[PDB]
Amino acid sequence: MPETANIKLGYIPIVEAAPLIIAQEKGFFAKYGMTGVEVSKQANWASARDNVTIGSQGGGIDGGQWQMPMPHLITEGIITNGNKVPMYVLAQLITQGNGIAVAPMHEGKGVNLDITKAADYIKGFNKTNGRKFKAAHTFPNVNQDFWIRYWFAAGGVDPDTDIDLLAVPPAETVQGMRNGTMDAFSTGDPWPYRIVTENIGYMAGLTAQIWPYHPEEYLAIRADWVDKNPKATKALLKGIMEAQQWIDDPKNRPEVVQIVSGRNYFNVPTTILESPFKGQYTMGDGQPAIDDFQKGPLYWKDGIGNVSYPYKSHDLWFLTESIRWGFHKNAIPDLDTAQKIIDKVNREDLWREAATEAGFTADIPSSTSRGVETFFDGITFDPANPSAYLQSLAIKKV
């Protein structure tokens, strides 16, 4: 019996939110006693951040969906103006379902997955086209900022000095692309489908290509709530695990799409989500379309290991990449400090415990590390030596 059947979890209306919505709507949360879960739509990431800092009692949220390393940054008060609100990372919600969109003006320039040959074109855009190449994500220092930064830098473009990388709302960004004032957009489903079908732009590449089966969105809840309600926390985890398993069975995806697209959730036409849930993406710019289930969003198991289990080696990559770009210079000055933060935030042990109790022992990874990670450009990240990873990178601020 959970200590409480209630909790307010925030979500952003994108495919990464699926496990939360499905766990609620298909009764997986209820199956384990969590009959009072409120899946609350957040206006944007800044609002989500603010709402978890105030907690449910103050009218906000107890936890929810997050881009990494938001839970860690909030725990240390780094992005909350010093207001430290400890949080626990409990499960990875999904992998893939993200990608980089580029404006039509850049077609035929080689601005695809590997932009190496187009680097000079991008770097000299102000002289040749009247403005610095402009790219956007919707929140700094997290997932989507990292994806586009890695993509730019892998090809020789410094995302801080060579272009204008800004935090801009998604709708405003797409309008900018339509108006010809925005050049690239680090986004995710359902945006790519609309951008391409409405001829607003093309997809340079999917994160599924940049880093196959990469860590992405996570479930994280305030530490004070989890410490007070350990049983309820494990119940929520089991509900999420079952929802993830359910979502990954192709037979259930039409219903998954119908549910999340509903008026009370995403409130969008199912047509813009049907394709990606089959791993089908029209890429454009003369490149072949993608038609591979393994390249679409995955919620339970991927080609390497278990999606849901939160590998500490992935938390390490996010903080290592934060260090790469000189983010939070005073708060996270070294890798030792990063590991200390990870050891207080990542609660993979609770995922293991919940999985064991639920009878999913066969799906539990044998280590807290998924081993050496390989990016599309040949660079490898060995969790045992993040220093070597950083030193192997051409563009960085350390």
Curated annotation (Swiss-Prot):
Subcellular location: Cell inner membrane
Induction: By carbon dioxide-limited conditions, probably via CmpR.
Upper taxonomic lineage: Bacteria, Bacillati, Cyanobacteriota, Cyanophyceae, Synechococcales
Alphabetical list of Gene3D superfamilies matching this protein: Periplasmic binding protein-like II
Residue runs in coiled coils: none
Function of the molecule: Part of the ABC transporter complex CmpABCD involved in bicarbonate transport. Binds bicarbonate with high affinity.
Family of this protein: Belongs to the CmpA/NrtA family.
Post-translation changes: Predicted to be exported by the Tat system. The position of the signal peptide cleavage has not been experimentally proven.
Quaternary organization: The complex is composed of two ATP-binding proteins (CmpC and CmpD), a transmembrane protein (CmpB) and a solute-binding protein (CmpA).
Chief site of localization: membrane
Gene this protein is translated from: cmpA
Any one of the GO CC terms: plasma membrane
The keyword Transport is assigned to this record: yes
Species annotation: Synechocystis sp. (strain ATCC 27184 / PCC 6803 / Kazusa)
Highest taxon listed in the record's lineage: Bacteria
PROSITE patterns according to UniProt: TAT
Annotated SUPFAM superfamilies: Periplasmic binding protein-like II (SSF53850)
Protein name per Swiss-Prot or TrEMBL: Bicarbonate-binding protein CmpA
Keyword Transit peptide: no
Record's bilayer topology term: Peripheral membrane protein
One GO-annotated biological process of the protein: monoatomic ion transport
